[PDB]
Structure formats: C-alpha cells, structure tokens
Amino acid sequence: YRIXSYDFXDELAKLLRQAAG
Amino acid sequence: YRIXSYDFXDELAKLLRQAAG
Amino acid sequence: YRIXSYDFXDELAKLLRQAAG
Amino acid sequence: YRIXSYDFXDELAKLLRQAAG
C-alpha cells in the first residue's frame, strides 16, 4: 500500500504496534 | 482517539499528511 | 484523501468511530 | 489489534485491500 515512494502500509502497521505499547 | 496517552487519532492524521507530501 | 472511488479519509474515520462506539 | 470486541487491525486491512482492488 505504497503512495509513490512512501511506505504507507508499513507506517500504519508501525503506528498500530507503537500505539499498543 | 487515544490509547492511554498515545494520540492514535493525531498520529494517523500525521501519517496521512506525511504520505501526502 | 481519495483512492479512486474511495473517500479514504472518511472510510478511516468510519472505522475509528465504529470501534470506539 | 482490538478495541473491545472490534477487530480494528482486520477491518483496516480489509479496507486497504478492498480499496486497492
């Protein structure tokens, strides 16, 4: 789920992780 | 939209922004 | 924030509200 | 990635996937 060269999918996965400790 | 002190709503907003320039 | 036919901003906002309700 | 009984993780994954095809 990239948006041009931004790794959107991965950044959201990382946000979910960090939000959960 | 928070999980304890983490502002999940704002962090998600910041990603949508960062992914959009 | 659009992806084709999706108002991605609004679809995300829906999931936030569905979950927090 | 749950909020109570709501599987946020999975509903997000489904949204991304469906909006990409």
Q: Which two tokens stand for residue A4?
A: 């041009």
Residue matched to tokens 């569905």:
C18
Find where tokens 């924030």 sit.
C1
Distance in angstroms (rounded) separating the CA atoms of residues D21 and B20: 21
Q: Write the DSSP string, C1-21.
A: -EETTEEHHHHHHHHHHHHH-
For residue C6 the two structure tokens come to: 């999706």
Q: Report how far apart, in Å, the C-alpha atoms of B5 and of each of A21, B2, C4, D7, D16 are.
A: 11, 6, 34, 21, 27
- Report CA dihedral (D7, C17, D15, A16) to the nearest 10 degrees: -60
Chain D residues with CB-CB distance to A under 8 A?
1, 8-9, 12, 16, 20
C2: β partners: C7
How many other CB atoms sit within 10 Å of the CB of residue C6?
16
Query: Alpha-carbon distance B11 to C18, whole Å?
Result: 18
Which of A6, A8, A15 comes nearest B11 by C-beta?
A15
H/E/C letters for each residue in chain B? CCECCECHHHHHHHHHHHCCC
Which tokens belong to C2? 């659009």
